[PDB]
Amino acid sequence: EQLKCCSGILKEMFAKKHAAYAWPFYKPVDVEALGLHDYCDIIKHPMDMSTIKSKLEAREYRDAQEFGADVRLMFSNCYKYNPPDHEVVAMARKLQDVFEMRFAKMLQ
């Protein structure tokens, strides 16, 4: 199953393989708690790993096509906010390379 296959890749984040890299970027960006009213101005549709995973958690994700669409969309927006020459930037890009490689292997 495509759904079960995707779960395996996501499991890596909590499998002690990419948890440290996705540790500071696991929870969403609470505008009220963090106090970032400017986030809405910079990003019209702010998304996070927790937001995307939450959909899959509630069995909302019927296929990997919808999941990948959100990941690529968020990644593009995240790159805009993520200031170059930063550890967080490298971590995000690294997560994409590992995911793409694994996803490409399971699909191709």
Side-chain angles (χ1 to χ4, degrees), residues 11-39:
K11 182 171 171 56
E12 233 196 79
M13 230 75 56
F14 231 95
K16 232 104 177 203
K17 294 154 184 242
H18 211 97
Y21 281 61
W23 225 69
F25 227 125
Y26 220 52
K27 304 106 164 204
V29 294
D30 283 334
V31 62
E32 309 161 311
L34 299 167
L36 33 93
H37 63 106
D38 215 52
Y39 215 107

Side-chain angles (χ1 to χ4, degrees), residues 3-86:
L3 275 166
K4 229 205 209 272
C5 210
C6 294
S7 317
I9 310 178
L10 304 171
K11 182 171 171 56
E12 233 196 79
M13 230 75 56
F14 231 95
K16 232 104 177 203
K17 294 154 184 242
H18 211 97
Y21 281 61
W23 225 69
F25 227 125
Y26 220 52
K27 304 106 164 204
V29 294
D30 283 334
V31 62
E32 309 161 311
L34 299 167
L36 33 93
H37 63 106
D38 215 52
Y39 215 107
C40 213
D41 238 299
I42 310 161
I43 311 296
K44 64 197 154 61
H45 212 282
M47 285 192 76
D48 272 288
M49 218 82 95
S50 216
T51 328
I52 308 161
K53 266 207 151 103
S54 182
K55 246 67 264 249
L56 164 64
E57 291 229 79
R59 217 132 200 281
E60 290 228 318
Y61 271 127
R62 292 157 204 169
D63 215 42
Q65 261 295 298
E66 213 158 289
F67 190 102
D70 279 297
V71 185
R72 277 295 127 72
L73 179 138
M74 195 262 254
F75 255 101
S76 209
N77 275 298
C78 220
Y79 192 53
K80 199 200 262 217
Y81 198 113
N82 271 310
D85 300 303
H86 209 15

